[PDB]
Ligand binder design. Structure first.
Ligand code: NAG
Ligand code: NAG
Ligand code: CA
Ligand code: CA
Ligand code: FE
Lengths: 638, 511, 638
């Protein structure tokens, strides 16, 4: 009855009558002003979202409660002081308000070195060895947990994180910020399994937990520390002129962190709209609810969009007459500041229920930070779904469409650990998308106590128009994926991804030829993957679109490509991020290249026995994915 | 708003457009209108309402089963009654009509010619073949192949002629429509009258509809269950089984049930039986039993709670299922739980009984009673008020909760009324057997409920059974809803049900 | 067009005109007389089976070649001698013809102890400590590899395997037998991945490989060793009167094994019959081809049945007019004597292609050993499919049906490592079935050089009638699973299996209550599983059988139950047998009970931290399987 063009206009008309700024301001009320995970204010907004979902008359509204462990700054405050070579001296630098979650919590003392950002590359260029010394690093480029992980690997005693004026132009220099050092996602005390009372909560701990204490300090406190340090920082780093390299031989720093664990109740509340054709298949739209500070840019916007998209889509079903072929689930996640806990615990608990049933995840967190450019990080398959949406949605400030760069796909950045979409793509194997109307520089007041509604209005004057544009892009993703009987997941796109991997491995063809190894099998594995998508593309062309049975047999083959890229050789408990393209582990394809980079330098770091195994499994992972895509189980060649 | 009605063949189509025209004049534009959809068979009409191409169509009680099955999902909303307008009847008699002095009885029908109303029909298939099912030669599945070898020649409408030629010997092709000479009640009787078949399975009112002469009506006989032939006028004394009345079905969700009954209520008050000479609702010069049956005198509203499985009843739904699949120590008793705590205690009880008692949970107390009806549940404990509601649907109590400690608790029952354990009529023997053994193992015990299992102990207060109960006493007499509660209590809750009426109680009173 | 009864009679008529004995005799020709894996005679029969499949005009016939490593007795023969306390003395006992594959191959010397069968229970009852000494064990009750694994755990230096006269009434006492000591299935040098040239064959070894030398010796050679031993064997063991316990303090045994590895080519040849409704779903029928000796009972019968079932079913499609709803694959496996290698390498290589596509595996190996009783080891789900076949197929000797014992399901034995059906059920998660017209005592000439056609005819006079009965049972499995649109996989059966596990765990309720643990969550997990099957059973009842779409949505839920019982917490490479009911690992349900048995004895063997984790994952494995079975992702309660 209703087509794509009828749906495009019906969505746009609802967006024009929707007031976003009034909703974001309502979430920044004194009642929900502080929304720490498992707090009264977090539950208050949860009950609000539950009732609101129930008011939009959705198909079903249910809640899931988890009991996860987090870390908080308790009675004993953490402090950073400078001491002499014999004992306590110098002066007290600062007692920070902010802290780093999942820290080791131990008193440590020693020499201090500036590792800058804390990138594995930053440490390698350091002229000063980081072994047995406390390192200080700027916020940015990477995750805190990544920052700590790189330091702990070089035997550092502790890590200090601060925000320079250059990257973070903030007036107040006494301002403190929050973060977490857990290298992973979900509750670190329940890895692989959900945090339900069913599991009885057994004694188990994640390997992603740091073994060294971490603390965040203010700009002013860092400058006090630089005063006691000597050596000018290199012009390579875009930083302040106050920046200093190492402490003098007379005085050194002493960090003491004493945070304790706390068990809390998290509430994950969902809302679903049942489909008419295939209700068992569903697209999930998630958004973070909790925030350490006031959270306007972090969770304020995301939760406002979640509620409004659930309103607009429900009105289109009941009133307009829109019939989705597949279901839509709206999710309000909690404990997101601690590493996307709520979302990862749900994926770990209902893994079997959404196996090959959930085909896409849309993340609404941090969708609005600036206004300059539009940035999206997603799976290769959603690439075409985005490209089509970009040349259909206009920019909120200018008049031009979002599609301006033809080679935008090559400038797409990989999903990071702090993103809520990471666990969906790397652990579960569900194509996820995270879009942003971002700025050249990240939002300064992100993890601070100055993430207020007022600061958001001052930085982004036309907030209502940008939030409407954000909901329009997200709204067209839902429509496109649930409206037509053909899935918009482009399996074709990936061939560029495999070609890129083999070209990078082709550069080291001489080193592979030297060993008793050939590359011809990886050429075929890649080639067979193309022939598999080419055969599937023709198979879509030679089939009737109106027939339900033929289409379902073809769409199920499309829903298996992301799953087949999850390594079937590693344990999901020890290495949850099984995905070979965007995961972490020796099983991933990037790690195969990273290991072979040590071979060219002729040092004792390259592991030949590990590389022969890495190449063996990856060749068969790409081949197995190719064989399973087309030709059944007998039409395969080799 | 317009209601799309489904019509089978040319005959029902001509009566439909005539019904659309006659109703348009007497009823204003603000009122309901009638539209018509052309279809080849009754199966095409069911698939049409499911695909939103039609809205309502009348079917036989035995064809309601097919309409309930996914993905059709149709619920009966308006049912027609027979007999008279003063005394409505929601059930008709199914009988077997044979020629006078033929020399064949009910037990001897092998190698004889038969005339059926249609495949899947109550009086024409579900009952006649149902009694002779376990006497059929092996194999029994498929069902149509066994009937093909039992009868020498048969005419069963709506049947696959390519796979079963013997069932379409008397009527070639097996037409599902009025276009066929032998279709429906009146068609199956014409199959007997013309001399094509030896036995015809139709309704008790079919003879009076086709024959008007009293001398011609005495030329036939009705076969009884005890291999006897009785007079045609005596159909109450000699019949096969009583089946639910024909009903009109619509979609479970968005099937405008309130709009269809609003249309049919005005149809009987303007063009019903003995109301208008221009057009008749239950009569047509183009054919018999078109749209609605000629034996019908009106329509009655079917309660919202009553679904297709509830409309037919346990006795009839099970009969159809066993007829298609092929089915002719006690089974585990499925207990019904209400809350989260009740099924948590049930699950522990399930393991301790070693699979003798299972657990099936429901949303409310009223929903558990409905599950015992269709077969999803077997037994549950209920208070005196709910025993009246359960008993009116067709569930008899077997055990009583005794709160007084005595020497013989199971031997002697208590009066108090007390909480009673109600169950289905066929599970009376099993429930009273299995639960009696459970009381001997988990009944009255010492303060060792911390280590061992105790049935009459709960985490909170009164879960599966009340905490102040000593034992569940077995009733010596076969007590019903009136026998257990007494003559005084039944009148008390009956009057209270008039102002405070539940959806299940109104649904069980319908039949 | 054709129903069940029409198919039953059409199959039976083809069976009456089929000559089996002539086929088994043709496979025992001088051309295929010795069929060692990767030998000329093995390839000869392979080419024969390929051509024969091609002659039956099947849909497609394809071959898969693997390059696996096996062990063989080479130039240096293994020997067993008795030596004095100072050096070489005594006398030479025997140089065996037979050997044990995948042995450590090392010269060892020490005291000898009779461990009887070699069961973990046998070792615990031994009055003589097995630590630091060579053990001798009888063939039977368990696998060689199991025999060795139990010994190596108690620090034994080596293992000797012999066949007593009591269990093995063989005339010739100089007869030698073959076996393998690898505790697992498949190529032990390519665990988790296939043995293809694509993997480049990296340096990797299975943990199932024994670290101690193993050798098989003859009855005569054992009696020579008993002559030098003292101590009478207990009446508990049904063994010969020659049986002796330990060697004297003066003399001890010296075993020396020197087998080498050999790379060989294995050919796996398949034949498929495409289905008309759902060709992508298929049932697999496999049979072993290779044999160390002549192999009449081991592979002679199995391969004869494979060829004839492929003939009969092809004739029913082309000539009779039989239309299977799902495909049928016939498989001729090689290297089966080495631990079902061919079959496991195929499952490890096309794992992705048969995920949720293969729903049953039928094994034809060792279907005919005796005539007394009928024994079947299979999954709980096929239980009802078997029960129905047993009351339909008549016994070849008597007139009565195979269904005589009502409580036959409770007397079903679990699948063992030597069975080819084990890898299908425990690794892949495909319900498998293995039936046998077995005897009270196992076939004596099984792994010997006396597995000839002549010996098979002498022991089983009416071989043709028993092979026809075997093909009839296997033939009705194929029919039933491919004929009707409803799957015959009974998900209901399993509830008895879960009830059995919780009752066994309920016996130790006091020990669980003592710790900070409750059992109420496992009661619900079990209960929720029942409610899930009960809801699915009603869902089949309320659906139209003729409708293709509704049925496919229901049958896909049935095909997921076996998969959901595979642990999703353990690595498929390290612990391939993921299945929690019939696998090996701490992840399995039996292992949870076995670990809790050490708690009641109050010794230092019970691991509380391991048990709390074991209980946590298993509770959620049963719960997750329940949640995924019915109610989708929102209809679930808790
Ligand atoms: C779950 O466990 C927590 C303690 O960790 C307890 O406070 C809560 O009441 C328990 N809830 C249930 C349903 O067991
Ligand atoms: C595979 O490798 C083996 C050596 O292990 C070699 O003999 C054979 O020719 C190779 N075949 C292919 C297709 O590479
Ligand atoms: Ca978890
Ligand atoms: Ca392998
Ligand atoms: Fe009827």
């Amino acid at each position: 009855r209703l087509y794509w063009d009828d749906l495009k206009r019906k969505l746009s008309e609802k967006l024009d009558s929707t007031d976003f700024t009034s909703t974001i301001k309502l979430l920044n009320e004194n009642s929900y002003v502080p929304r720490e995970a498992g707090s009264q204010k977090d539950e208050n907004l949860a009950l609000y979202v539950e009732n609101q979902f129930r008011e939009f008359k959705l198909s079903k509204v249910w809640r899931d409660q988890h009991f996860v462990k987090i870390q908080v700054k308790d009675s004993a405050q953490n402090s950073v002081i400078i001491v002499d070579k014999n004992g306590r001296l110098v002066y007290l630098v600062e007692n920070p308000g902010g802290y780093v979650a999942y820290s080791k919590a131990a008193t440590v003392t020693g020499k201090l070195v500036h590792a800058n950002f804390g990138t594995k590359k930053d440490f390698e260029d350091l002229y000063t060895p980081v072994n047995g010394s406390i390192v200080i690093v700027r916020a940015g480029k990477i995750t805190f947990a990544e920052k700590v992980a790189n330091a702990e690997s070089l035997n550092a005693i502790g890590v200090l994180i601060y925000m320079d004026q250059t990257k973070f132009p903030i007036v107040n220099a006494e301002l403190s910020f929050f973060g977490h050092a857990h290298l992973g996602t979900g509750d670190p005390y329940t890895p692989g399994f959900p945090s339900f009372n069913h599991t009885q909560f057994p004694p188990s701990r994640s390997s992603g937990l740091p073994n060294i204490p971490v603390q965040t300090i203010s700009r002013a406190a860092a400058e006090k520390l630089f005063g006691n340090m000597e050596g000018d920082c290199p012009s390579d780093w875009k930083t302040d002129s106050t920046c200093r390299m190492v402490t003098s031989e007379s005085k050194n720093v002493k960090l003491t962190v004493s945070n304790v664990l706390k068990e809390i109740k998290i509430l994950n509340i969902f809302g679903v709209i049942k489909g008419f054709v295939e209700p068992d298949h569903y697209v999930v739209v998630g958004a973070q609810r909790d925030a350490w500070g006031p959270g306007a840019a972090k969770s304020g916007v995301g939760t406002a969009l979640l509620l409004k998209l659930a309103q607009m889509f429900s009105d289109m079903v009941l009133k307009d007459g829109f019939q989705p072929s597949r279901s839509i689930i709206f999710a309000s996640w909690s404990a997101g500041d601690f590493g996307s806990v709520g979302a990862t615990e749900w994926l770990e608990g209902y893994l079997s229920s959404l196996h090959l049933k959930a085909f896409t995840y849309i993340n609404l967190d941090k969708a609005v930070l600036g206004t300059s450019n539009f940035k999206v990080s997603a799976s290769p398959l959603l690439y075409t779904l985005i490209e089509k949406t970009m040349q259909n949605v206009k920019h909120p400030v200018t008049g031009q469409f979002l599609y301006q760069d033809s080679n935008w796909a090559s400038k797409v950045e990989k999903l990071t650990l702090d993103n809520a979409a990471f666990p969906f793509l790397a652990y579960s194997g569900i194509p996820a998308v995270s879009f942003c109307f971002c700025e050249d520089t990240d939002y300064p007041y992100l993890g601070t106590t100055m993430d207020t509604y007022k600061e958001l209005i001052e930085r982004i004057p036309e907030l209502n128009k940008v939030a409407r544009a954000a909901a329009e892009v997200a709204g067209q993703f839902v429509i496109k994926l649930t409206h037509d009987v053909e899935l918009n997941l482009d399996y074709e796109r990936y061939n560029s991804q495999l070609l890129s991997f083999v070209r990078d491995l082709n550069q080291y063809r001489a080193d592979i030829k030297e060993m008793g190894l050939s590359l011809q099998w990886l050429y075929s594995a890649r080639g067979d993957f193309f022939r598999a998508t080419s055969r599937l593309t023709t198979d879509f062309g030679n089939a009737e679109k109106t027939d339900r049975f033929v289409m379902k047999k073809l769409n199920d083959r499309v829903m298996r490509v992301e799953y087949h890229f999850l390594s079937p050789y590693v344990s999901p408990k020890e290495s949850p991020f099984r995905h070979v393209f965007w995961g972490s582990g020796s099983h991933t394809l990037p790690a195969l290249l990273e290991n072979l980079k040590l071979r060219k330098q002729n040092n004792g770091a390259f592991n030949e026995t590990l590389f022969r195994n890495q190449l063996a499994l990856a060749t068969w992972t790409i081949q197995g994915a190719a064989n399973a895509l087309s030709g059944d189980v007998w039409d395969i060649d080799n | 708003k317009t209601v799309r009605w489904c019509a089978v063949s040319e005959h029902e189509a001509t009566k439909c457009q005539s019904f659309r025209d006659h109703m348009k004049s007497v009823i204003p534009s603000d009122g309901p209108s009638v539209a018509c959809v052309k279809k080849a068979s009754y199966l095409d009409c069911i698939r049409a309402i499911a695909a939103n191409e039609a809205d309502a169509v009348t079917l036989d009680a035995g064809l309601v089963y097919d309409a309930y099955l996914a993905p059709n999902n149709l619920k009966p909303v308006v049912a027609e009654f027979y007999g008279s307008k003063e005394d409505p009847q929601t059930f008709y008699y199914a009988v077997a009509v044979v020629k006078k002095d033929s020399g064949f009885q009910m037990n001897q029908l092998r190698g004889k010619k038969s005339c059926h109303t249609g495949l899947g029909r109550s009086a024409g298939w579900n009952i006649p073949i149902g009694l002779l099912y376990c006497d059929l030669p092996e194999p029994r599945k498929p069902l149509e192949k066994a009937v093909a070898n039992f009868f020498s020649g048969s005419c069963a409408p709506c049947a696959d002629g390519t796979d079963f030629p013997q069932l379409c010997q008397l009527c070639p092709g097996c037409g599902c429509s009025t276009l066929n000479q032998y279709f429906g009640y009146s068609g199956a009787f014409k199959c007997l009258k013309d001399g094509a078949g030896d036995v015809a399975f139709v309704k008790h009112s079919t003879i009076f509809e086709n024959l008007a002469n009293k001398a011609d009506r005495d030329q036939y006989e009705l076969l009884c269950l005890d291999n006897t032939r009785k007079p045609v006028d005596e159909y109450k004394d000699c019949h096969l089984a009583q089946v639910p009345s024909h009903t009109v079905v619509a979609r479970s969700m968005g099937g405008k049930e309130d709009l269809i009954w609003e249309l049919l209520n005005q149809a009987q008050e303007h063009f019903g039986k003995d109301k208008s000479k221009e057009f008749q609702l239950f009569s047509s010069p183009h054919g018999k039993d078109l749209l609605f049956k000629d034996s019908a005198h009106g329509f009655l509203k079917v309660p919202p709670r009553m679904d297709a499985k509830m409309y037919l009843g346990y006795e009839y739904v099970t009969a159809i299922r066993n007829l298609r699949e092929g089915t002719c120590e006690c089974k585990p008793v499925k207990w019904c739980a209400l809350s989260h705590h009740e099924r948590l205690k049930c699950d522990e009880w399930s393991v301790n009984s070693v699979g003798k008692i299972e657990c099936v949970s429901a949303e409310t107390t009223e929903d558990c009673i409905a599950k015992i009806m269709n077969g999803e549940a077997d037994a549950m404990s209920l208070d005196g008020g709910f025993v009246y509601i359960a008993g009116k649907c067709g569930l008899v109590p077997v055990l009583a909760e005794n709160y007084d400690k005595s020497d013989n608790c199971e031997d002697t029952p208590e009066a108090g009324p007390n909480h009673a354990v109600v169950t289905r009529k066929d599970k009376e023997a099993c429930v009273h057997k299995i639960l009696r053994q459970q009381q001997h193992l988990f009944g009255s015990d010492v303060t060792d409920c911390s280590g061992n299992f105790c049935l009459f102990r709960s985490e909170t207060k009164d879960l599966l059974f009340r905490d102040d109960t000593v034992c569940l006493a077995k009733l010596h007499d076969r007590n019903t809803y009136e026998k257990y509660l007494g003559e005084e209590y039944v009148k008390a809750v009956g009057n209270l049900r008039k102002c405070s009426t539940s959806s299940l109680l109104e649904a069980c009173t319908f039949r």
